[PDB]
């Protein structure tokens, strides 16, 4: 005590009917706020700061619920203060919580569970405490730098006038690469020179210097370290792959070059990123990671890269324009794992409110990562503007005219002005892309003549506009901003139709890419219409995992398209996620560097050779294996790798994981054993290479993701069979292989939820505990539900982004598959029928648990032993041996 029974104040952003915010803190158990949405939180003011000392919390029924409560004495920091999670009914004595004499002027109550509904409610909430007689500070107003006032922009523009200091920045920072990629210890071994461009192309030389450094030029930056790294891979047998395993163990002396090379490259641009991937991926990445990452790009010949960081700060400062408030603004804008969809215009709000300190930290870091860009020569492609405004815009701007989009996925899609209206209609996309463009100059400054956008993306509607009309609009729109722009267009699935394609009346200032060009290419449409266009790599999908790559049609079809066309200018790679297949990313960017097709196989013996820092007959012999079983040549149409059994929502006859995605193993699954028994064999020789180590657990989770599609398939005929001992013994080896399987995950760093997780709750600095919790839920529902049911279920997105990762095995694959196992051994057993699982309800009790107050999922792998856990599987668990098991 004592009760806090005047001057409280509370809002929501979203209600069902009738059932409003107020209705939360009426004094009346009858009366109850109702969420209708995501926000499924109240935010309640208490007229000055208290120190609480109680909270009281009343339900509409006596379901199931579980929440959190957090408390602010500064108005910016919302801190967590109380929570439930056991599983107690409510009733009508409510739930009384303890807390620590906390001052508060603000509580924030997330109910991120109910039993009964999808819909969450609180009847009443009384609150207790002490009036400490103060009263909440102003909340500061979100403002940020113009890139003008920086120091950004001083040394944008000094690069830019003055070439002995660019040169000599460029030359510093292949120098700062060499010692962040190799150690600090090997930057003096080097000398880095600026040449010209060999006929029009990219260039590099490596050669000796006469002293026993190597001498590297190159025409710019990401030259010069595409011949550092040709270097390593051919000289030193060293391989760079901050993602996916490295080899960066130099030898003792630095190797002679002999005879000096030069190395062109036929391409203008070697793109990467899919918007996909700064979700997927990208998501939680400090400085550091784009660092390395860019790094990474530049060594591997990389000069175009999709860029959207901090494009929440423009999208601001352009709606604030237009009649928005920075909370509507917010309230628009995706959370952090959700920018892909956001900015493809499938999406809005979903996994926000973002800090109010996510703008300026944002704007930051992509002023940062343009300083880099401009040192190496790379082009971030930035964004254009098409049309893509709030449902609401109407109404804030009531002579604007909009085509409503539809849904996307249970996802209300944003709206989209009409490119163009009638006379005596105000045109609001010329006035909204005029101050979209302006803002955009105004937050990173001229950095790029290359901008994206693409408007229906998988779907929409362009209401009564031509298809054509719009395209040209748009484009003629975005070179009046820049009369260097050329629009970065994305072809998926025969969209921009040719109708749309033909509307671009300057072919040259367009550039298209051809998404899935390795698995289902469409550039000839492109090609025949004189567009420009990028031959890319798509490879992987979701970030789903497995053994699974291209790499014959990668060593010929791109040499092919070349000889065969007028309009290609570039390769590039666009996964939606870059985490799986190291070989088929090393391979696709070498293809940049020659104009004949090459031998896949004696390529791949060549790159083991290096990726290990060894090899042998009996690990070659593996690797053609998998040449000749997993990343065997295929001309069918799919999407990602082979998904895992484990990974799939239980059922019977399961084809897939996702919705889109396929099962179905192509090869020979006792062959593609045999690759594990050689790894296994050689282990010990082996083990001190970590790429090594990351190739044997790849391989060998792909054995028992293979050998547990076997085992399902035999528990599900002893359950249609009615064999209730048979099930139980098949049923009972299928869960303790998944076991198996979540010890070879716990080897990698990079397979452990926990790093996902925790790079999440700690990617800006000086979050509140709301911030952390926010953000968890982000990296927790994209791997699973993605979105909330309407999304999982009805849009087909449920489990689209299923890793094959530790501790999300073992708390959520596992615990599907044991559940339902249990459902059919009781009905087995002379026990009622199965009933049926909810899934999703599962599914999302574990998307919004906390790593504070739950379970924290570990950031450090374990020291299990990958080839004896290839022994037991090969023992126990496998498809060679499945007879002898049973
Ligand atoms: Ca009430």
Known sequence: GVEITEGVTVTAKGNTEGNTADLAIDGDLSTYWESSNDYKWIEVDLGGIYELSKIEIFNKDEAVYKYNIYASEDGENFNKIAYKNNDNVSDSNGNMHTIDNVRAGKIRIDVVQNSNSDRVNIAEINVFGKNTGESLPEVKKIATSNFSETPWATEYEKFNSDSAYANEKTLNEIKNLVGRVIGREFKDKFIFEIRDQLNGNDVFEVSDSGDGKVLIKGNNGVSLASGFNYYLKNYCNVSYNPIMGSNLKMPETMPSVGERVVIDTPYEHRYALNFCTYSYTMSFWDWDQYEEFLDWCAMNGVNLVLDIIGQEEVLRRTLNEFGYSDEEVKEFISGPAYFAWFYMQNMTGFGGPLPNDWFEQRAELGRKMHDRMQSFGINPVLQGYSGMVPRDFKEKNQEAQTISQGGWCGFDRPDMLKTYVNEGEADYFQKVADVFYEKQKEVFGDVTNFYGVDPFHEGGNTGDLDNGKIYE???????????????????????????????????????????????????????????????????????????????????????????????????????EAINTNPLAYELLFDMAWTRDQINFRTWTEDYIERRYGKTNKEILEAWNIILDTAYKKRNDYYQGAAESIINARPGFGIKSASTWGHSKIVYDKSEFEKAIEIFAKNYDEFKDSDAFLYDFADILKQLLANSAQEYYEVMCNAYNNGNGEKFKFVSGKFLELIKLQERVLSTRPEFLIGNWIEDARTMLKDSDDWTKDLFEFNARALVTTWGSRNNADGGGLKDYSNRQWSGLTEDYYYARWEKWINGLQAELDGGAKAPNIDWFKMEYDWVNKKSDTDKLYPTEASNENLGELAKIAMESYSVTNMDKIL
């Open 473 to 575: 609009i748009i484009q003629n729109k975005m070179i009046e901003h820049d009369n260097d722009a050329v629009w970065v267009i994305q072809n998926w699935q025969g969209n921009p139709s040719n109708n749309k394609l033909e509307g671009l009346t300057k072919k040259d200032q367009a550039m298209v890419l051809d998404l899935f060009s390795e698995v289902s290419p469409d550039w000839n449409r492109l090609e025949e219409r004189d567009l420009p266009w990028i031959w890319n790599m798509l490879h992987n999908f979701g970030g789903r995992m497995g053994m699974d790559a291209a790499p014959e049609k990668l060593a010929t079809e791109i040499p092919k398209a070349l000889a065969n066309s007028e309009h290609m200018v570039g390769i590039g790679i666009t996964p």
